[PDB]
């Protein structure tokens, strides 16, 4: 579960999701096995949808600025514009 | 150079430092909040009529087209206020200096919101002391297209003097002539007067079915030899991008058109010629904060420079000039956030030696090719009898000489009070420092309140007195009564940066951080050689 | 700038497409083929009996010569072809720009092989216009000479006149003086007229046992006062190496004076003078070669040229300057392997409107020290009655005062038609343009075919009419016939391209590759401030 929360990819459709809380469903701890299991627990797994709090936004939104340095120009690089 | 360092006297937790801290603080805090009622512009009320049409609102308009997070350089943002019977928020035009694609740019907008947009004296003041910014440190310029005309009922002072009106389009046609690009973005009515500002331009960009621009809109033109035409048909965007050749770019709408302008600016070629030995940037070695402490809270109180100086320069490292001699006038070399200094700063009175100390500095800085920075808190010129048989009158002469002709860039900052011939010695708005500012604790004016209903109440008993009579204490005491409080009125900040004294009103714990962006800015422009006049030995 | 974008509307699989591609690539090889044979030189027969002399051929000293692998822009390849009765493959000598020692230079040479590398009039035409090439642009000059003298029989248009033979000399005397540096290779005869191509040289070679520098060879000396004496004794590499001294090295053979070259080259000091502010290189958006099928094989179906300039510029990205305004010419700026770029294509006829719209665009490309590129392909001015009587006279002319002054470095390719005011207007040959090249689709006149024709023919109907007759159509058709051909004939990219009204017909599908290559040549020498002339209001 580790690995699987280390791990990340994007720019697709992943079903790296989908494992993560498969290996963290409580059925999973116990032996709760047998073929029918992905069928069954079917909501707790594939959860529906919902655009999320500002929560996420606010922080998508510090990230994405603080990942572009503005401009560094050649001319003062020093320059406080950036 | 563990030895240019400034080791401070100042203890950040004693009772009195929290004392001015204090007064220092809340005098920011009114700052703060008067300069939020100025960000609403013409007030809710039409200001949500504007986004009403599908428009954009000014200071959206900026920070949509600056880059991601890019700083803003705010110009006298107390514009008009309490000038005008009205209020005229920002003067109705907000200017600045931002990058954009990487340029640090000049930008004007019109806040269409305020009074139509329309050009009140002061806004006309406003965009020209922008231009000139510009023109001075060769930064391009983005005009935001959106006013209305000029306020008809005061064109006296909008529309015939040099400085007025159309002083806009000559440095304009000007700025493009010394290579300066002029950007031009229609958003709004741009009738007759601002009609120009697109007209004359390297490049336009027009808002369809919202930019309009025309000579003289319907009413004008119905005024005219008849005729009723819609403001579309007039001179709308579509007639101006496919039929006129007015504008360039054909937006559709407030972002696209921003967008437009960026790509303008974006084809550039743009390099600076400014040229310093700029040494890494390292931060100063107080908090810049403890400023707010520093400064006493009780005006005409005695306190040390040098401590003002220790919390701007980088890593508090200060190589002081003539160190003991006329110490009433302080002058050093530093570094600001990298860029090299010539510092003078005043500390106290000023006599004769404190000038020619300061005139000869500012031929060592000119000699270097150094920006000069000026710290104002002078109350005058030490008087008296052999102080004036002693040249104190020339050679404060030799001080201004130095000041007014010095090319490299100067820089001045009101920190204490400018009162009479010091302002003048100090690069006050006069000597066209780059730029201007001014610290909430300051106050301007040409001589205290009293001093001045001292001398102007003074004559009125000395042109009573060889006329057979005296001033009685009750006509006298009326005499200084409207001075005394005029003086106390036209002294503070907000009366100056309403009337463009100085490009605005600032955080004395922020000035560290002004002046780096300003000094980088103008060295989008060369440092010129300087050549004096004739010194008065 | 995912908006600076420029999506094709070409579909690469369509029928219609691989139609015009079909009948462009076989252009392509049809230039590929004759490249070739002229690559022969003076046929494999003399050819052979070169190398027997133990001489390195033309073409080979030039691979020698430049720098590892680096690329090599060949001039006028295609120099008098079939134009003088012979076959004088390139006209007898080989020049272009290549790296050496990390310079772009200026390489000339001549074939030994070809009539005796002699000069006939187009020889000397193209030795002059390298070094034009090499003063506009400032590329260091490298002679490798091996000629004889001047072709005797044809002297009228070889020696005399201001831009003959001898106005070599000039120019080179000229550039030495503005320091480019002018170095000579002698690896041959070098009888009197070539003689002093050596001798006016900053640096001078000589293969020994080969290399003869002689005012006059033994011919003529003999043909003096009597006297007989040979060729190495009357001026060899011993005796002007050892005792004249107008020579400056002593090389052992072709091989070892290409590298004794080399190494003047080496201590040049050399630096370049442009400057752009040119960015990352990014490749454009579609396949280059797509371009075979952008251009109709029918000559005169129209076709939108922002799909030309989609396939040259880096990623594509094509910001235009009023977009819709005299569509019929295309202007805008983005950038080319880096380098800012502004671009004029022709998009149809042209209206008064294009020409300002033009005219204005130059001067911002010219404000702003970006190079200019004009993509012709214009059919010439609408003509009428009304657009005569709207001025499509004079606008035309602001569009040719501001091409002609335009000082910033200009670039122009032939992609489809120059025919007359046309070919004037969008920088043509009399104007100087840095480098000018020629499409193999592309087709210039005068005017058109029978165009001329027509009008050649209707006088002398008019003529012939106030004169109480006609012309039956039977004379008329015999007035028109010489003419239809005439034009159809001189209007070929050889034909051109031969007489060097043209420094070349390149490959449609590299166009970008080369002005890369001649751009940053051009930058060897400084983007010069610009100033126009009088504008026609
Ligand atoms: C500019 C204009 C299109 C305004 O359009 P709008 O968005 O509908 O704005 P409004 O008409 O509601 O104008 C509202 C304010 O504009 C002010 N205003 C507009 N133009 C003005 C002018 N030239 N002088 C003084 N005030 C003006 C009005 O006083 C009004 O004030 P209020 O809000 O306190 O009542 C319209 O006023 C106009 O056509 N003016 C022409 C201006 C002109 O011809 N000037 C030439 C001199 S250079
Ligand atoms: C240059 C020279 C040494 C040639 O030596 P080479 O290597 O044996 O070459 P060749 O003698 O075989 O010459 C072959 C070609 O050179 C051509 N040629 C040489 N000099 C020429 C000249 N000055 N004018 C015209 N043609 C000339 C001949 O026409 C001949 O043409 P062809 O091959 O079609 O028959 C010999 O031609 C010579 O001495 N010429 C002197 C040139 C001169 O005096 N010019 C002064 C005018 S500035
Ligand atoms: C081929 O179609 C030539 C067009 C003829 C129109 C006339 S001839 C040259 C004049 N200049 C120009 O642009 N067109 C005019």
């Not at chain 1, 701890?29 to 069954?40: H, P, Q, Y």
């Not at chain 1, 922080?59 to 514009?81: I, K, V």
């Not at chain 2, 007014?404 to 400018?418: D, N, Q």
Request: contains cysteine.
């Amino acid at each position: 579960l580790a690995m699987l929360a280390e791990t990340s990819v994007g720019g697709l459709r992943t079903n790296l999701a989908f494992l993560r809380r498969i290996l963290g469903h409580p059925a999973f701890a116990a032996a709760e096995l047998d073929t029918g299991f992905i069928a069954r627990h079917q909501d707790d797994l594939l959860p529906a949808p919902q655009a999320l709090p500002e929560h996420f936004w606010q922080a998508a939104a510090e990230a994405w600025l603080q990942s572009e340095p503005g401009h560094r120009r050649d001319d003062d690089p020093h320059s406080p514009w950036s | 150079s563990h030895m240019a360092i400034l080791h401070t006297q100042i203890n950040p937790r004693s009772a009195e430092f929290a004392a001015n801290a204090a007064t220092m603080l809340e005098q920011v805090n009114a700052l703060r909040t008067l300069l939020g009622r100025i960000h609403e512009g013409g007030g809710s009320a039409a200001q949500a009529r504007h986004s009403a049409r599908g428009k954009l609102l000014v200071r959206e308009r900026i920070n949509r087209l600056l880059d991601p997070g890019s700083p803003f350089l705010e110009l006298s943002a107390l514009a008009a206020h309490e000038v005008y019977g009205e209020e005229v928020a920002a003067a109705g035009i907000v200017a600045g200096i931002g990058r954009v694609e990487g340029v640090e740019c000049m930008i004007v907008g019109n806040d269409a919101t305020v009074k139509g947009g329309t050009y009140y004296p002061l806004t006309v003041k406003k965009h020209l002391r922008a231009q000139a910014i510009a023109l001075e440190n060769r930064l391009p310029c983005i005009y935001l297209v959106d006013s209305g005309g000029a306020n008809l009922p005061r064109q006296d002072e909008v529309f015939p003097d040099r400085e007025h009106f159309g002083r806009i389009f000559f440095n304009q046609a000007n700025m493009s002539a010394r290579g300066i690009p002029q950007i031009a973005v229609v958003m709004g009515s741009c009738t007759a007067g601002g009609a120009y500002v697109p007209a004359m331009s390297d490049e336009t960009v027009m808002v369809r079915e919202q930019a309009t621009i025309f000579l003289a809109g319907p009413p004008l033109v119905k005024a005219a030899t008849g005729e009723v035409v819609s403001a579309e048909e007039l001179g709308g965007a579509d007639v101006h991008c496919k039929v006129s050749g007015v504008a360039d770019h054909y937006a559709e709408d407030d972002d696209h058109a921003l967008a437009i302008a960026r790509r303008c600016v974006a084809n550039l070629n743009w390099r600076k010629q400014g040229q310093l030995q700029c040494r890494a940037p390292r931060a100063p070695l107080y908090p810049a904060e403890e400023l707010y402490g520093v400064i006493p809270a009780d005006s005409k109180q005695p306190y040390d420079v040098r401590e003002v100086i220790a919390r701007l320069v980088d890593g508090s490292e200060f190589d002081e000039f003539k160190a003991l001699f006329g110490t009433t006038l302080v002058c050093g070399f530093a570094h600001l956030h990298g860029y090299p200094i010539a510092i003078l700063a005043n500390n106290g009175i000023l006599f004769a030696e404190a000038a020619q100390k300061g005139a000869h500095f500012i031929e060592l800085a000119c000699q270097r090719g150094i920006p000069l920075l000026f710290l104002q808190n002078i109350t005058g010129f030490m008087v008296g009898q052999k102080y004036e048989a002693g040249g104190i009158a020339k050679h404060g002469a030799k001080l201004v000489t130095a000041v007014a002709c010095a090319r490299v860039p100067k820089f001045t900052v009101l920190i204490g009070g400018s009162f009479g011939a010091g302002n003048y010695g100090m690069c006050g708005r006069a000597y066209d420092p780059r730029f201007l500012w001014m610290w909430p604790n300051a106050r301007i004016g040409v001589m205290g309140g009293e001093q001045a209903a001292g001398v102007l109440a003074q004559v009125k008993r000395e042109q009573a007195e060889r006329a057979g009579q005296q001033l009685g204490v009750e006509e006298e005491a009326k005499i200084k009564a409207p001075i005394l409080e005029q003086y106390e009125h036209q002294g503070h900040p907000y009366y100056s940066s309403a009337r463009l004294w100085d490009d605005g009103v600032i955080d004395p714990a922020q000035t560290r951080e002004v002046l780096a962006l300003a000094l980088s800015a103008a060295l989008n422009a060369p440092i010129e050689p300087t050549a004096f006049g004739v010194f008065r030995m």
